[PDB]
């Protein structure tokens, strides 16, 4: 099996890091310097560091050479044991389902548990079921 190696990145720059590495691979698979990498695992839950999957530590070193994202951790490649190739794929309960229970972030009903009614296929807005807590314009001026 290929082995999992951990590498540092700046906060939130992991998504641009992932797509450019894929494109790098495709950009170098036909030259004299190919990539020995199998896959790169980039979980939605983690922050600050990402997972690159290859047979030996020399392979990742010679692959992530020239990228300005993975420059900062380039000097070290903390590995995980064989038993940790499984728990990386595990996802605890995307997060888009009607007739469900979601909460707010912003607005007036902060940290108030609400309900979804309809989902818009344009991925622009979403329908919510909350309760108004205004004064009906009696207390405020």
């Amino acid at each position: 099996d290929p082995n999992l190696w951990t590498v540092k990145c700046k906060i939130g720059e992991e998504r641009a890091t992932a797509i450019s590495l894929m494109r790098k691979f495709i950009a170098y698979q036909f030259t004299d310097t190919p990539l020995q990498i199998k896959s790169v695992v980039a979980p939605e839950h983690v922050k600050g560091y990402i997972y690159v999957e290859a047979y030996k530590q020399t392979h990742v070193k010679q692959a992530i050479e020239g990228v300005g994202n993975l420059r900062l951790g380039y000097w070290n490649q903390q590995m995980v044991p064989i038993k940790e190739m499984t728990d990386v794929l595990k996802v605890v309960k995307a997060n888009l389902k009607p007739k469900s229970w979601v909460r707010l972030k912003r607005g007036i009903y902060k940290d108030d548990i609400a309900q979804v009614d309809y989902v818009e296929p344009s991925q622009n807005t979403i329908s919510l079921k909350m309760i108004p807590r205004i004064d009906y314009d009696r207390i405020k001026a």
Binding site: R15, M22, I26, S39, V91, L96, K97
Partner: protein, 116 residues
């Protein structure tokens, strides 16, 4: 290839059969590269919006499905290398799963994610 790479990070989805992670443009212009004769999602947006959903967790850079541990685990070793997903939530309606069994395509629940 250059078609399996999502162009833009905005408006990306994932399939329920091969977990194909692409842009809304690619699903309509090109469609599912790992299944085009059973799904036929190239040339429209209703079939792209019907089977394929946005509700998914996690990305993987599938490069060598013939030799990889991850590929075997997700049963994606008989697919084309590219952008894949690990947990694609949802379910197909009872209108396209009945035709898939008669043609020899076993629709499997790709949702490897645990529920509570």
């Amino acid at each position: 290839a250059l078609e399996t790479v999502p162009k833009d990070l905005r408006h990306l989805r994932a399939c329920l059969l091969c977990s194909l992670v692409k842009t809304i443009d690619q699903f309509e212009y090109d469609g599912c590269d790992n299944c085009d004769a059973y799904l036929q999602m190239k040339g429209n947006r209703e079939m792209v919006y019907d089977c394929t959903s946005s509700s998914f967790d996690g990305i993987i850079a599938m490069m060598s499905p013939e030799d990889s541990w991850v590929s075997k685990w997700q049963r994606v070793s008989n697919f084309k290398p590219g952008v894949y997903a690990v947990s694609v939530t949802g379910r197909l309606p009872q209108g396209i799963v009945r035709e898939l069994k008669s043609r020899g395509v076993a629709y499997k629940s790709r949702d490897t994610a645990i529920k509570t």
